[PDB]
Write a protein that binds this ligand. Structure first.
Ligand SMILES: Cc1ncc(COP(=O)(O)O)c(CN)c1O
Ligand SMILES: *Cc1c(COP(=O)(O)O)cnc(C)c1O
Ligand SMILES: [Ca+2]
Ligand SMILES: [Ca+2]
Ligand SMILES: [Ca+2]
Ligand SMILES: [Ca+2]
Lengths: 410, 410
């Protein structure tokens, strides 16, 4: 094995295969939606399949129709013109987008700042590039009293400051957050912005869940703050936008001098993404772009649907004594489990508490979830191992099945 | 810009956004087929599109149905049992597979041996991993007197031996060959095998055009030669097998201790490939695997269909005094361009002769093709700069259009 991938071979998701196996569990682990994608999205792929051309090579950096659509939509959001050719790169999901960014902008020996918990792929990506991850935890503040929420989690600005040195190449932002469901405030993005301009550093911003924010919160794009356009790469994904996760298409939006470096990586790695998926997606985007103001638009209906399902989950977890953190956005809910004193002690390995809890819950209660320590570097695990994450982008029937398990819990 | 991509930003194909533009001209440039894909390939995408789960995440290293099918087809070919999970890896095209091999197996300072002309991505891939490309040209032998063919090209064994040293990590082989259409012989493959065993080095075998073998030649896989299985990665593609270049799906077949390393690269880069695409591809395979002995099998029908078109091209090229090199395989044909008139000081730079010619033939004759010098290291271009590459995976209509211009050359 090449030196660049020394000890990058284990992967949380690989390890989680033998969990979801057994047919009769209700899987609330993986971010596998089992609702239907919008009908028009399925239809458009079918339509694309029967056109010859759309089954051949398209433009390497993205299908013209797609990049046209994206530049239209994000033009609206940034309130500025987005160049479809120079300021956008279409890649294999947000994974690929992340990988482009890091591969093309981050050198060996550079520091990259990561907030914990993080989407687990951040650490190995930065490591393979020969770069050093510098970790900083999110910490809880006190509750309003009545509710525990994603918004009761923040970072210490003075702590954050001290993580930037002349060795900081970049910071990785994830709002809405996986796994907390935190929707970063303007003030919080202002602190991060301030520092990248003070230290002349990049900001990579994972914003795949941009559409999934719930009432009382607003997705704010760091890249839109003063001084940030020139220094930010902002990521987005078709799986998350169209509930079509198996399409594996994402985009990186940012300034032409940073985006060029990502395109250099792409052309030297896989080059093109599939034509029919891009063709189909372009059309979906036009369908929903042309109706952004209406409740019908998928960018509106989907959070509306999920906010309901979220609230069902707060209750189901509360019902069994699990203490949930109600998320401002996204489709994951983190629950604290330490208040059940569970009948483990005797999976005997040196796993964190939460991997154990989930194993127990699968064998005994017929339900899977993801341990939050899967999203933490070593030093961080003990400070997060009583937390367990559940996914709610599920259809009614599934959440029913979940409800049956919780009601039968004692 | 990160050091690892330094001066890798020039891409040959980005540059052929030259006079590709003019709508009037017949493009025999890029390997963009305008034949229809086999109608069942299109149906299965459509069918897959309407299944909800086929639009969500699948197994990261390859859709289970697709690896099962690859396992079955290739185990017939290899005369061995191939593990679908441990010995295959589905990647975003052959491009993706190549990148997975280099990144996963090659360190800074290794030497990788490449044969010239080479498919152009081989050079910067090896460069991006900080390895040093080591070039060896293909050379002409005296012809049989009658015609010029790909089999009249080959390499000096003693010259090859001399490129092997203790710094050699791998050799890249591409049969059938792009751009000359050379089908490597058992004797030639035996030389490469010998040196790989003797020096303990990897072979990466770009076999995308494997079904495109013409009359009186046979695809043989180096991986089946004694001692090769355990040191060979053999690459395939959907775009070539099913004339569906826009699907961007390929695979690496090899031993587990090597495949595991490609998997590490994948999971830390794009992870999962498109589900609807992979589901449909598997189906397409089963259709054809079940009828191999039959002339309807796309495997048998496509090369048969294409051979006619190859000969058509040879005639057309002869008929205007371009000396065709008749290809044993794949869908590209090189013509020696040098005994024409062709004015050429109307340009006056000293970018290579074949680029000048292609610009000339585009403007003056409304026909594009690819200069062979594009596929050569700088030291090598003088020796291939009077060579031009034409693609013939085209529909009758297009070879009619081409024949109009060849009839109208003089
Ligand atoms: C020899 C060779 N290898 C690899 C590729 C890349 O193909 P894919 O689109 O499957 O990545 C091509 C493109 N025709 C090729 O000619
Ligand atoms: C699921 C997820 C991804 C992966 O995105 P794809 O577009 O499916 O490649 C990336 N980032 C975050 C924060 C995620 O939750
Ligand atoms: Ca090792
Ligand atoms: Ca502009
Ligand atoms: Ca600095
Ligand atoms: Ca050796």
């Amino acid at each position: 094995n090449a030196k660049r991938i020394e000890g990058l071979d284990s992967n949380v998701w690989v390890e989680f295969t033998k969990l979801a196996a057994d047919p009769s569990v209700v899987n609330l682990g993986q971010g596998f939606p089992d609702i239907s994608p919008p009908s028009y999205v399925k239809e458009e792929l079918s339509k694309a399949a029967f056109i010859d051309n759309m089954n051949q090579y398209t433009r390497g950096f993205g299908h013209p129709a797609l990049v046209k659509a994206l530049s239209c939509l994000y033009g609206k959001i940034y309130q500025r013109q987005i160049d479809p050719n120079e300021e956008i790169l279409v890649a294999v999901g947000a994974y690929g987008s992340l990988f482009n960014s890091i591969q093309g902008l981050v050198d060996p020996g550079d520091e990259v700042i990561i907030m914990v918990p993080f989407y687990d792929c951040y650490e190995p990506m930065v490591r393979m590039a020969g770069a050093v991850p510098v970790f900083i935890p999110l910490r809880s503040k006190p509750t309003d009293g009545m509710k525990w929420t994603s918004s009761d989690w923040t970072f210490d600005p003075r702590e954050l400051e001290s993580k930037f040195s002349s060795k900081t190449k970049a910071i990785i932002l994830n709002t809405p957050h996986n796994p907390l469901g935190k929707v970063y405030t303007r003030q919080e993005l202002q602190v991060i912005a301030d520092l990248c301009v003070k230290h002349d550093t990049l900001c990579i911003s994972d914003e795949v869940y941009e559409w999934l924010v719930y009432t009382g919160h607003t997705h704010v794009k760091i890249a839109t703050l003063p001084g940030m356009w020139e220094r930010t790469i902002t990521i987005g994904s078709a799986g998350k936008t169209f509930s079509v996760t198996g399409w594996k298409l994402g985009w990186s939006i940012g300034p032409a001098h940073l985006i060029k470096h990502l395109q250099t990586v792409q052309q030297n790695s896989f080059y093109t993404c599939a034509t029919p998926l891009q063709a189909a997606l372009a059309e979906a985007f036009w369908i929903d772009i042309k109706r952004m103001d209406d409740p019908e638009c998928y960018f509106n209906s989907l959070p509306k649907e999920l906010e309901v399902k979220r609230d069902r989950m707060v209750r189901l977890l509360n019902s069994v004594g699990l203490k949930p953190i109600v998320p401002d956005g996204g489709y994951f809910i983190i629950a604290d489990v330490s208040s059940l004193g569970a009948d483990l002690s005797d999976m005997n390995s040196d796993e964190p508490y939460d991997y154990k809890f989930v194993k127990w819950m699968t064998k005994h209660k017929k339900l899977t979830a993801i341990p939050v320590s899967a999203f933490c570097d070593s030093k961080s695990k003990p400070h997060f191992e009583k937390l367990v994450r559940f996914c709610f982008i599920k259809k009614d029937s599934t959440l029913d099945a979940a409800e049956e398990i919780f009601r039968a819990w004692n």
